[PDB]
């Protein structure tokens, strides 16, 4: 028996009361106490779109029917909501690819495109590694890579991790990215096979024959990840994926790895780099996550693994819109002396 009931109450009083600020902490905290109470769920969700906030409380609707389909008062209400939130993230689409379309008008030869592009370069390294707790700096990645001297003080297996890295992102800027054709089950391996090749040999390039443990979770059974990885590359070649919009397709791609996890080590790193991949494919320039953004990043996940990925959907498309925004930060401006 949750003590939480107590902390809905009030929230509902304070609402009533008009001290909203105490209320959505009361409801926060309800929640906190028991993240799968359907009343404090449906009740925050009201909160929310008295607020306006409808992709909250649409969210937060869709979180009570996941847990109690038949609960009338958030059916009737998520009904209201999932049309409007529909038109939301289509107008957030639409700004992105608004500024893709910018970018893409920049001449190739460019110098300060080519030189933002060699900087981010290095960025979606330090953060690809940083974000799993890599302990290389920035500058200390760019030395490894530049000159090719170990970094005093630092272990042989975290700098294998960076070479790995730049290894694979070679590998698909070179192959892949230009290649017309399927993206085969062979296409995955490989780019793992880089990804971990420094780091683990035995293991790189071929998917796990064992359960794992992945904090709380277990995913798929190793007798089920040779099937479902082939469903997988099946749905990236299909007729379906090129229907969605491809930054929805990329994070999809993403969560479907990450969710299968078909190898024992290095399935995040090899998942962001098929995300990569899959954007730049469609004309879209590659992304990062960035290292500070690990929290947001592992609560979209969770999240998509509590049935709704649209977070993650929306995730991934303020880390595509972050990327433009800084290959636009690299745009003309009027001076003269």
Same mark, same amino acid.
């Given at each position: 028996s949750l003590e939480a009931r107590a902390a809905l109450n009030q929230a509902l009083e304070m609402k009533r009361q008009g001290k909203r600020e105490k209320a959505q902490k009361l409801f926060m905290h309800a929640l906190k106490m028991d993240p799968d109470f359907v009343d404090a769920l449906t009740e925050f969700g009201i909160f929310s779109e008295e607020d306006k906030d409808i992709i909250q409380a649409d969210y937060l609707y869709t979180r009570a029917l996941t847990i109690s389909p038949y609960h009338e008062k958030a059916l009737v209400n998520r009904d209201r909501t999932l049309p409007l939130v529909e038109e939301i993230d289509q107008r957030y689409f639409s700004i992105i690819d608004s500024k893709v379309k910018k970018v893409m008008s920049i001449p190739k030869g460019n110098s300060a495109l080519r030189r933002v592009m060699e900087e981010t370069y290095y960025h979606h390294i330090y953060h690809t590694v940083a974000i799993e707790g890599? *302990?290389? *700096?920035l500058s200390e990645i760019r030395h490894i890579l530049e000159t090719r001297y170990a970094v005093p003080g630092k272990s042989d297996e975290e700098q294998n991790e960076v070479i790995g890295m730049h290894a694979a992102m070679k590998y698909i800027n070179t192959t892949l990215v230009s290649r017309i054709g399927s993206v085969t089950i062979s296409d995955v391996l490989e780019i793992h096979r880089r990804v971990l090749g420094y780091v683990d040999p035995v293991e790189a390039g071929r998917f796990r024959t064992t359960q794992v443990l992945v904090g709380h979770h277990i995913p798929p059974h190793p007798q089920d990840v040779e099937k479902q990885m082939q469903e997988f590359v099946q749905w990236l070649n299909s007729e379906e994926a090129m229907n969605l919009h491809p930054v929805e397709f990329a994070a999809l791609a993403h969560y479907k790895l990450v969710y299968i996890?078909?190898?024992?080590?290095?399935n995040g790193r090899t998942s962001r780099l098929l995300m990569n991949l899959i954007l730049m494919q469609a004309g879209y320039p590659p992304i990062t996550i960035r290292k500070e953004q690990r929290s947001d990043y592992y609560h979209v996940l969770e999240a998509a693994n509590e049935g709704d990925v649209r977070p993650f959907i929306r995730f991934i498309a303020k880390c595509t819109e972050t990327t433009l925004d800084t290959l636009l930060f690299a745009t003309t401006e009027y001076s003269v002396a």
């Open positions: 890599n *302990t290389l *700096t996890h078909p190898f024992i080590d290095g």
